[PDB]
Amino acid sequence: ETSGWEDALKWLRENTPEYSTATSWWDYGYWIESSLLGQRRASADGGHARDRDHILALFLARDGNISEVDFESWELNYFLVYLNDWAKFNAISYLGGAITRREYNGDESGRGAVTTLLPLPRYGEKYVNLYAKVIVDVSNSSVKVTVGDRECDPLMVTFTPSGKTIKGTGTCSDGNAFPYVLHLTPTIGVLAYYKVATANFIKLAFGVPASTIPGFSDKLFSNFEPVYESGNVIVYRFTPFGIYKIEENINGTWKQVYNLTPGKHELKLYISAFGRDIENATLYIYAINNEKIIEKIKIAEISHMDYLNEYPIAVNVTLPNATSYRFVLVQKGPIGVLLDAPKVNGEIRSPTNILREGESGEIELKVGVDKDYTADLYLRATFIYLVRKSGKDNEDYDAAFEPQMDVFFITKIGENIQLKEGENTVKVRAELPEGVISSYKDELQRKYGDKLIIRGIRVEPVFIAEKEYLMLEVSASA
* Residues in the annotated binding site for a glycophospholipid: 30
Residue 70 beta carbon to Cl ion: minimum distance, rounded to whole angstroms: 7
Q: Which is nearer to Cl ion, 73 or 222 (CB)?
A: 73
Contact 221, 239 (CB under 8 A): no
End-to-end CA distance of the chain: 47
Query: Which residue, 273 or 419, has its beta carbon nearer to Ca ion?
Result: 273
Stretch that binds Cl ion, among 67-75, 177-185, 202-210, 350-358 (CB under 5 A): 67-75
Q: CA-CA distance, 444 to 439, in Å (whole number)?
A: 9
Distance between CA atoms of residues 158 and 50, nearest Å? 35
Cβ-contact 461, 377 below 8 angstroms:
yes
Residues 6+ apart with CB under 8 A from 162: none
Residue whose Cβ sits closest to Cl ion: 73
Kind of pairing between the strands at 78-82 and 22-24: parallel
> Looking at beta carbons only, is 181 or 273 nearer to Ca ion?
273
C-beta of 73 vs 200, nearer to Cl ion = 73
Q: Which stretch binds Cl ion (CB under 5 A): 37-45, 49-57, 65-73, 176-184?
A: 65-73
Which of Ca ion, Cl ion, none interacts with 404 (beta carbon under 5 to 8 A by kind)?
none
Nearest CA to 453 out of 381, 400, 375, 378 is that of: 400
Q: Which of 168, 172, 184, 57 is nearest to 129 (CA)?
A: 184
Instruction: Between 273 and 354, name the residue whose CB sits nearer to Ca ion.
Output: 273
Which residue's Cβ lies closest to Ca ion? 273
Question: One-letter amino acid identity for 400?
Answer: A
State the nearest-atom distance from the C-beta of 18 to Ca ion, in Å.
30
By the 8 A CB rule, do 277 and 240 touch? no
SS3 103: helix
Q: How far is the CB of 333 from Cl ion (least distance, A)?
A: 7
Q: Name the pairing type of β-strands 360-368 and 337-338.
A: antiparallel
Closest CA to 259 of 329, 328, 322: 322
Binding-residue pattern over the window 20 to 59 for Cl ion, x denoting contact by CB under 5 A:
----------------------------------------
Least separation, in Å, of the C-beta of 334 and Cl ion? 5
Give the C-alpha separation, 178 to 193, whole Å: 9
- Nearer Cβ to Cl ion, position 98 or 410? 410
According to DSSP, the β-strands at 293-305 and 278-288 are: antiparallel
The binder of Cl ion chosen from 73, 100, 129, 424 (CB under 5 A): 73
382 binds Cl ion (CB under 5 A): no
In the complex, the smallest distance separating the C-beta of residue 336 from Cl ion, rounded to whole angstroms, is 12
Instruction: Name residue 143's amino acid.
Output: V
> Residue 73 binds which one of Cl ion, Ca ion, none, with CB within 5 to 8 A depending on kind?
Cl ion
Q: If you write DSSP's letter for every residue of 162-197 in order, what string do you get?
A: T--EE----EETTS-B--EEEEEETTEEEEEEGGGT
- The least CB distance from residue 265 to Ca ion, in Å, is 25
**Binding partner of 223, given Cl ion, Ca ion, none, CB within 5-8 angstroms per partner class:** none
68-76, 106-114, 119-127, 335-343 -> range binding Cl ion (CB under 5 A):
68-76
Question: CA 285, CA 322: separation in Å to the nearest integer?
Answer: 12
By a kind-dependent CB cut-off of 5 to 8 A, residue 117 interacts, out of Cl ion, Ca ion, none, with none
Closest CB 324 distance from Ca ion, rounded Å: 25
Question: Could you tell me which stretch among 73-81, 96-104, 307-315, 385-393 binds Cl ion (CB under 5 A)?
Answer: 73-81
Q: How far apart are CA 377 and CA 400, in angstroms?
A: 38
How near is the Cβ of 200 to Ca ion at its closest, in Å?
12
Q: Which residues are near Ca ion by CB under 5 A?
A: 273
Q: Can you say how many angstroms the Cα of residue 386 is from the centroid of all Cα atoms in its chain?
A: 19
User: Can you say how many angstroms the Cα of residue 191 is from the centroid of all Cα atoms in its chain?
Assistant: 23
From the list Ca ion, Cl ion, none, which binds 273 (C-beta under 5 to 8 Å, kind-based)? Ca ion
Residue 191 vs 273, nearer CB to Ca ion: 273
Stretch that binds Cl ion, among 36-44, 70-78, 80-88, 392-400 (CB under 5 A): 70-78
Please report, as residue ranges, which positions from 334 to 353 form the binding site for Cl ion (by CB under 5 A). Answer: none
Q: Which residues bind Cl ion (CB under 5 A)?
A: 73
